[PDB]
Design a protein around this ligand. Structure first.
Ligand SMILES: [Mg+2]
Ligand SMILES: [Mg+2]
Ligand SMILES: [Mg+2]
Ligand SMILES: [Mg+2]
Ligand SMILES: [Mg+2]
Ligand SMILES: [Mg+2]
Ligand SMILES: [Mg+2]
Ligand SMILES: [Mg+2]
Ligand SMILES: [Mg+2]
Ligand SMILES: [Mg+2]
Ligand SMILES: [Mg+2]
Ligand SMILES: [Mg+2]
Ligand SMILES: [Mg+2]
Ligand SMILES: [Mg+2]
Ligand SMILES: [Mg+2]
Ligand SMILES: [Mg+2]
Ligand SMILES: [Mg+2]
Ligand SMILES: [Mg+2]
Ligand SMILES: [Mg+2]
Ligand SMILES: [Mg+2]
Ligand SMILES: [Mg+2]
Ligand SMILES: [Mg+2]
Ligand SMILES: [Mg+2]
Ligand SMILES: [Mg+2]
Ligand SMILES: [Zn+2]
Lengths: 100, 64, 55, 196
RNA sequence: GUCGGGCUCAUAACCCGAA
RNA sequence: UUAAUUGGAUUCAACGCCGGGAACCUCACCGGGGGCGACGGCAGGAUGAAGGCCAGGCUGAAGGUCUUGCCGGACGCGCCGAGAGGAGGUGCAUGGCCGCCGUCAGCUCGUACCGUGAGGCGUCCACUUAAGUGUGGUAACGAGCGAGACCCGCGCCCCCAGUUGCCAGUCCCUCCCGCUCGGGAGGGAGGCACUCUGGGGGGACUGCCGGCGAUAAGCCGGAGGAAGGGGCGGGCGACGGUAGGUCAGUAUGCCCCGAAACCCCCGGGCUACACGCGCGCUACAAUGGGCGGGACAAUGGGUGCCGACCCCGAAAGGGGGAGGUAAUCCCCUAAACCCGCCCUCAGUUCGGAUCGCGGGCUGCAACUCGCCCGCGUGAAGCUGGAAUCCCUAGUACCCGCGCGUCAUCAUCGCGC
């Protein structure tokens, strides 16, 4: 009778916005909602040689991509589930909802 | 070398003249004043400006 | 059948089973996390993919 | 895992953007955007002459939709064509325009000065243009044109300046064109004001 | 005197080992 | 040297470099065998062009060609243009990118003024700074790009948050000990204290004190403090030059090949070996070798995959297989170090090159030319001439581990 909401994004602000909107929805109704839990950030690091040829001193680039995550628990009530199910996150945010 | 930066000095001199009766020999008070009287966004820059204003206050009060 | 003698064998391992999706080079292919891009091509498109050089 | 999902989306968009870059060179291509809807995918394309992309009453939007769905991985696409927001603040568009002017046969100095005049009149803090290649003879050379404010080193230069590059293919070979533009609303870290 | 190695951007001078 | 041992790079700034750990592929080299000309037009062609085959020869193998005779219906390389394609030439025809001068402190502009002019001035002098960084003086007064500011991470404190992360106090159940006054270990209820994860905020300013300097710019020494004087480690490299490297990553002009210098298949070669050189690994032993026992990590990675757990085998390995699309499951109980016993200064119980026999794994293929295990075998080496390299603090030395490459293979690169 509880629903688990998972969020992920490359942008911290949008992620925060979606979590705060879900929190406002859970406040607007009589329902307990475990606060947004921050899971460890996923980091993708790739190191490459800079020169196209092989002459000269070897030097390297360190490119990074960062993927942030949050976890939210809420109790599945239809009066509250309809409001959250009709929210639209920005295109750079993945949202997944499941019932446990 | 801890050489003060030019734009810090310019802005601190501008602030000091406009409100002569607003800055004292207290670093915390001047830090809050710099926070309220500008749009400075960096905490480091705010501290630098406040320190120079403190030195200006004690230099003019001492009479140079 | 004569066109049979133009056709390549479909390998599944070795350097000949992987080509860069942007320029067609064999060799220095970055296989990390499902990318298939040469080291040369990854450098110039990395900002468009969202990678940054923080340090 | 989750990392593999984000990388797949980024690569497809890059391939589509490059294909459209070359394909719509005469239309003043200025980027794209892709939105995902429960019915499919909304693809918005930016250009200067949308009639070229439409191509005399269709017959070209259908071709592009077929290309997008078959060659690339979009499911059930729908292409809309719009207009560029601030064309004179976009370095890439200006680099392509200068390259086309060179391909027509205008002298490189006159083209550079005309582009700089338009950009500065349209409200930019600064612009820098570089043109390199076999200009006036078989020995190559580089020439630089500049006016205004323009940061080059450090984080502000990375996040604020718009940069663009283009090749111009003349009869004697290629000529490279580089453009950098700083917007009117850009503010440097050392620009503080006193709250009156 | 022969052969090999050092030093020098390199050659000569100079230093070392060997038969 | 060879049929070929494909090519680039030669002081710093070539030589574990071209992410170059090549069995096929890669591939550009060598021996051999096949295939390819949109579009314009010539001989031609339904009385059927071009194209496709059961069988057996030639052949490494092939309807490639041939023999034996079947197929299908519309274009036409026997010809001239023309084109696709080209890791063929040219980096001294170019674009883009990268190394070095050099993260050095430089390169310029508006107006004025000096010189017939090339030019000069500002950009010079004194002190100061990591810095054309600043303070004073001055035919200069002002301004731009670089420096700094900026961005990421590390160390201290506060608020918010409590799952897949944490377990101290509290309740119950079970099992051990010196038999239980006391001390331990699991499991469940329960909690977010503590650790941790990650959003927001605080904190350091030459601010305070005493000297030197000028009473300026700053410098030297003290307190308090988690932290003290760019707090520490990184990213970001101005106008230019270097005919520096790269057309063998991709783009591109010209010149060439265009029935071969284009496209595929088989077998070789890049792995050769009187010899000169770079960078390393293992040693020459006690500041040790062997045998049994005892300790404590972090970074990363996983569905074309990581595999706990059980069984079989002396080992390498083999047969089943939970959970995992991952703060949940797995790789994953590191080594250097500590305790006890043998060896006692010896070419040895040092060293482990070289070679014989046997057992495995990956793969379409292991001879050329792969990696692993058992028994046996036991080379040089006993501290290194002239010369010459790296490093200022959690740094150097010493020790293992993760990822890239990858079907298999790490004395390498990048990180812990
Ligand atoms: Mg800087
Ligand atoms: Mg000599
Ligand atoms: Mg060679
Ligand atoms: Mg090999
Ligand atoms: Mg080969
Ligand atoms: Mg050159
Ligand atoms: Mg110089
Ligand atoms: Mg005159
Ligand atoms: Mg001068
Ligand atoms: Mg100078
Ligand atoms: Mg002078
Ligand atoms: Mg300066
Ligand atoms: Mg620093
Ligand atoms: Mg040259
Ligand atoms: Mg050279
Ligand atoms: Mg070789
Ligand atoms: Mg031994
Ligand atoms: Mg042991
Ligand atoms: Mg022995
Ligand atoms: Mg054998
Ligand atoms: Mg073999
Ligand atoms: Mg001996
Ligand atoms: Mg001895
Ligand atoms: Mg290597
Ligand atoms: Zn590529």
């Amino acid at each position: 009778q509880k629903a688990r909401i998972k969020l992920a994004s490359t942008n911290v602000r949008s992620l925060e916005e979606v979590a705060n909107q879900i929190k406002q929805i859970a406040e607007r109704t009589g329902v307990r909602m475990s606060g947004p839990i921050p899971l460890p950030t996923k980091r993708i690091r790739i190191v490459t040689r800079k020169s196209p040829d092989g002459e000269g001193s070897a030097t390297f680039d360190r490119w990074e991509l960062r993927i942030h995550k949050r976890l939210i628990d809420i109790e599945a009530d239809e009066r509250a589930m309809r409001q959250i199910m009709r929210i639209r996150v920005p295109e750079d945010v993945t949202i997944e909802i499941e019932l446990i | 070398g801890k050489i003060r930066q030019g734009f810090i000095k310019r802005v601190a001199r501008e602030l000091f003249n406009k409100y002569p009766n607003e800055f004292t020999r207290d670093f915390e008070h001047n830090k809050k004043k710099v926070e309220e009287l500008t749009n400075v966004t960096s905490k480091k820059i705010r501290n630098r400006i406040a320190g120079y204003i403190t030195k200006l206050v004690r230099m003019k009060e001492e009479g140079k | 059948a004569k066109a049979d003698y133009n056709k390549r064998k479909p390998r599944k391992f070795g350097k000949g089973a992987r080509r860069c999706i942007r320029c067609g080079q064999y060799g220095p292919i970055i296989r990390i996390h499902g990318l298939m891009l040469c080291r040369h091509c990854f450098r110039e498109v990395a900002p468009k993919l969202g990678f940054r050089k923080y340090e | 895992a989750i990392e593999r999902y984000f990388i797949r989306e980024a690569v497809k968009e890059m391939l589509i953007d490059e294909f459209l870059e070359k394909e719509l060179r005469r239309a003043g291509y200025g980027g794209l955007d892709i939105k995902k809807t429960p019915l499919g995918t909304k693809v918005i394309i930016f250009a200067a002459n949308p009639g070229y992309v439409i191509g005399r009453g269709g017959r070209r939007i259908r071709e592009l939709t077929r290309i997008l769905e078959r060659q690339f991985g979009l499911e059930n696409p729908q292409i809309d064509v719009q207009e560029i927001k601030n064309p004179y603040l976009n370095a890439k568009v200006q680099a392509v325009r200068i390259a086309q002017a060179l391909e027509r046969g205008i002298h490189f100095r006159r083209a550079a000065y005309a582009a700089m005049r338009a950009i500065m009149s349209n409200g930019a803090r600064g612009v820098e243009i570089r043109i390199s290649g076999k200009l006036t003879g078989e020995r190559a050379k580089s020439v630089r044109f500049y006016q205004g404010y323009l940061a080059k080193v450090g984080n502000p230069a990375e996040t604020l300046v718009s940069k663009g590059y283009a090749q111009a293919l003349l009869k004697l070979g290629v000529i490279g064109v580089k453009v950098a533009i700083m917007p009117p609303d850009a503010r440097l870290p050392d620009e503080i004001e006193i709250i009156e």
